[PDB]
């Protein structure tokens with residue numbers, strides 16, 4: 001791989017701030033050599049500076065944790081990816097042919113209930129921030145709509161899929177997702193900055209506060225830091241740090257979290273767009289310099305996360321901007337991948 005470009009990374013962060021991110025930061029673990037940069041504030045009212053050690057809400061990076069647990073259950077013989085979801089969760093879905101593999105790769109056709117919840121950004125956030133939902137509550141919300149397409153038809157993102165994933169994990173193991181993440185991933189990898197505290201609203205330790213950008217251009221930002229994230233749970237409630245996500249994705253890609261066979265299934269790509277694929281709770285992004293990286297993006301109110309690693313896990317990158325509902329910042333932060341993996345032009 002070419003050398004990571006710190007000057008380019010510095011510019012990306014600086015640009016994100018110019019676009020509305022109170023703070024932005026990135027950490028690269030380049031085969032044992034660390035690159036770390038940050039600019040801006042963790043708390044815009046107090047002015048405390050953001051740092052690469054600040055904890056944050058990783059959004060759907062959570063999906064990769066959920067998929068890891070499920071694939072270990074496959075290795076253990078407790079789950080068959082091609083078995084129907086209704087086999088393990090009787091009567092849950094109206095189609096007894098929607099499979100676990102389809103749900104894990106967003107090819108189930110299940111309607112995404114969050115499209116209803118967040119039609120309006122801030123009102124939607126105020127509506128769910130302090131709510132506690134059961135997994136079934138969420139599935140029911142989804143099922144009120146018809147499916148959007150035939151199972152296995154094509155990739156269509158839906159948080160409902162990983163809500164089902166969490167329900168499967170708890171049913172098959174008889175434990176909470178928190179317990180499973182801890183025993184199967186957090187402890188083994190010693191991810192000391194990683195937690196799943198749902199429905200607690202507090203983020204443990206020093207963290208970056210999240211700032212939700214309202215739908216109205218120029219509108220005042222909303223501190224969205226403390227919420228239950230119950231609308232996502234196994235689809236997006238994990239809290240972590242740049243160091244911990246780098247360790248996790250490097251461990252995943254270097255083959256330390258499941259059998260070679262299950263990692264292969266995890267990387268069977270379904271087309272998302274011309275430069276992206278989705279496997280099982282895992283995203284593939286193709287960079288301009290012809291390099292593909294693996295991991296996941298995350299969006300939780302006030303937090304945009306990119307956490308990706310090279311195919312062999314030797315280089316990993318995690319970037320975070322503490323604002324959300326700001327496409328300019330979202331697009332800009334994606335450039336950290338180009339600077340970190342592709343290097344200087």
Ligand SMILES: C[C@@H](NC(=O)[C@@H](C)NC(=O)CCCC[C@H](NC(=O)C[NH3+])C(=O)[O-])C(=O)O
Pocket residue numbers: 058059060061114118119120121122124157159212232235236296297298299300301302303324325326
């Ligand atoms: C992107 C990532 N998905 C996630 O991380 C999941 C957990 N988050 C969402 O589906 C976004 C919820 C709305 C956020 C809100 N948007 C609105 O409110 C829009 N009205 C915001 O930007 O904070 C993935 O699929 O890889």
